[PDB]
Specification:
The complex is a heterodimer of chains A (67) and B (349). Helix content of chain A is 55%, strand content 0%. The relative contact order of chain A is 0.18. Chain B is an alpha+beta fold. The chains are: A mainly alpha (67), B alpha+beta (349). The interface between A and B is medium-sized, with 32 and 37 residues. The structure holds calcium ion (2 copies) and magnesium ion (MG) (2 copies). Chain B: Adenylate cyclase that is activated by host intracellular calmodulin and catalyzes un-regulated conversion of ATP to cAMP, thereby impairing microbicidal functions of immune effector cells and inducing apoptosis of lung macrophages.
């Protein structure tokens, strides 16, 4: 269990742009950079697996709670 | 390539050294940012003067022959007619570093510094020896110097007519090498691709996900989507050095402050290129992003992961980081910028 300020820093890594949400394009970039080339299909699947509210993106709460 | 612009020249970083900074910035694909180096240290760092670590806390000197060094008599330092409450506090700093590895050496400038010194306006009016300067300090102490079959000039002095000179003392290396300022890094923005292996080592035992699964679990992929998010978290976590920032690192017997694995690497890649052009280490600790006493300075020198150099005001710093983050460069701020409304984030926080 990392502290809450610790989880936000790592979260900004995913959240490339302004807004505090993780987009599918943001994730597709993160995965590619970390060595995994994934299809749009599989990309939407990682989002879907974390998207508790179903709004198509991963907000702060759903990132921290993913654990 | 050598000073390529104005930024490079105002940074106060020796050319040869700055040449490595740029080379490493590209070798590691990381944007490196530094705080300005006071210009009276640049020449020292370049000819082989040692740089100071966090264990040393004796304010430097900005006047007299002693400029660029860390004088043992605090009245010689940037604190010349201050208060006995202060001149005492400085005695302490001197003390601290003198019991811990730091030596008290005899100030002896090099022929060339003597140039820079006289060329800069810090000193005059010498038969060669009895120098002069209009810096308040000269109305309390008398300065002078003498050569040697060493080329160097030894600095002497006395408190104003109650003679007998001595050999000016500055704080130096345990190896005897006098200390001058160190290049304080402001922050390090690593490209996220620099953490692929870290993530794997922690989650797939160094294996690409596709290779990991094919090796440990025979033939909607629920477990695979889980494994992906796993190195995805591990990568960011290493990228910002979560784990590593909880403790202190140490170079031998010197506390290098709070620093991530990647930043340490850079420090080494950098101190390296410094040794290669004839210098000693110039980065002695972690970055300002993990400094509990964050300092505010309007200008910061920046070196893209591409080699481009520029000066940045805090405001241009914000837009800079923002653009860089869109290119996948990771950046995290000092933890106190938030409370004091000095965050570089336009997000939730
Ligand atoms: Ca976003
Ligand atoms: Ca959501
Ligand atoms: Mg320092
Ligand atoms: Mg340093």
């Amino acid at each position: 269990t990392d502290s809450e300020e610790e989880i936000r820093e790592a979260f900004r890594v995913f959240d490339k742009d302004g807004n505090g949400y993780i987009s599918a394009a943001e994730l597709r970039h993160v995965m590619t950079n970390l060595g995994e080339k994934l299809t749009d299909e599989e990309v939407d699947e990682m989002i879907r697996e974390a998207d508790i509210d179903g709004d198509g993106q991963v907000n702060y709460e759903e990132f921290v709670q993913m654990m | 390539a050598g000073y390529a612009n104005a930024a490079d020249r105002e940074s106060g970083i020796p050319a040869a050294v700055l040449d490595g900074i740029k080379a490493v910035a590209k070798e590691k694909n990381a944007t490196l940012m530094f705080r300005l180096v006071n210009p009276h240290s640049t020449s020292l760092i370049a000819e082989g003067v040692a740089t100071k670590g966090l264990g040393v806390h004796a304010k430097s000197s900005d006047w007299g022959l002693q400029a660029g060094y860390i004088p043992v008599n605090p009245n010689l330092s940037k604190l010349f007619g201050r208060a006995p409450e202060v001149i005492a506090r400085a005695d302490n700093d001197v003390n601290s570093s003198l019991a811990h590895g730091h030596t008290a050496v005899d100030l002896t400038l090099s022929k060339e510094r003597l140039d820079y010194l006289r060329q800069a306006g810090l000193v005059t009016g010498m038969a060669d020896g009895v120098v002069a300067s209009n810096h308040a300090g000269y109305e309390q102490f008398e300065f002078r110097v003498k050569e040697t079959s060493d080329g160097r000039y030894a600095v002497q002095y006395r408190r104003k007519g109650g003679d007998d000179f001595e050999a000016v003392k500055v704080i130096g290396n345990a190896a005897g090498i006098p200390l001058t300022a160190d290049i304080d890094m402001f922050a390090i923005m690593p490209h996220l691709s620099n953490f692929r292996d870290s993530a794997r080592s922690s989650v797939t035992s160094g294996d690409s996900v596709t290779d990991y699964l094919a090796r440990t679990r025979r033939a909607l992929d629920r477990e695979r989507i889980d494994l992906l998010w796993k190195i995805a978290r591990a990568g960011a976590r290493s990228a910002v050095g979560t784990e590593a920032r909880r403790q202190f690192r140490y170079d031998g017997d010197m506390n290098i402050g709070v620093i991530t694995d990647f930043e340490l690497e850079v420090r080494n890649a950098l101190n390296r290129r410094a040794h290669a052009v004839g210098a000693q280490d110039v980065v002695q600790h972690g970055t300002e992003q993990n400094n509990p006493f964050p300092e505010a300075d309007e200008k910061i020198f920046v070196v893209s992961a591409t080699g481009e150099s520029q000066m940045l005001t805090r405001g241009q710093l914000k837009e800079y980081i923002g653009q860089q983050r869109g290119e996948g460069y990771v950046f995290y701020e000092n933890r106190a910028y938030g409370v004091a409304g000095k965050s570089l984030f336009d997000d939730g926080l």
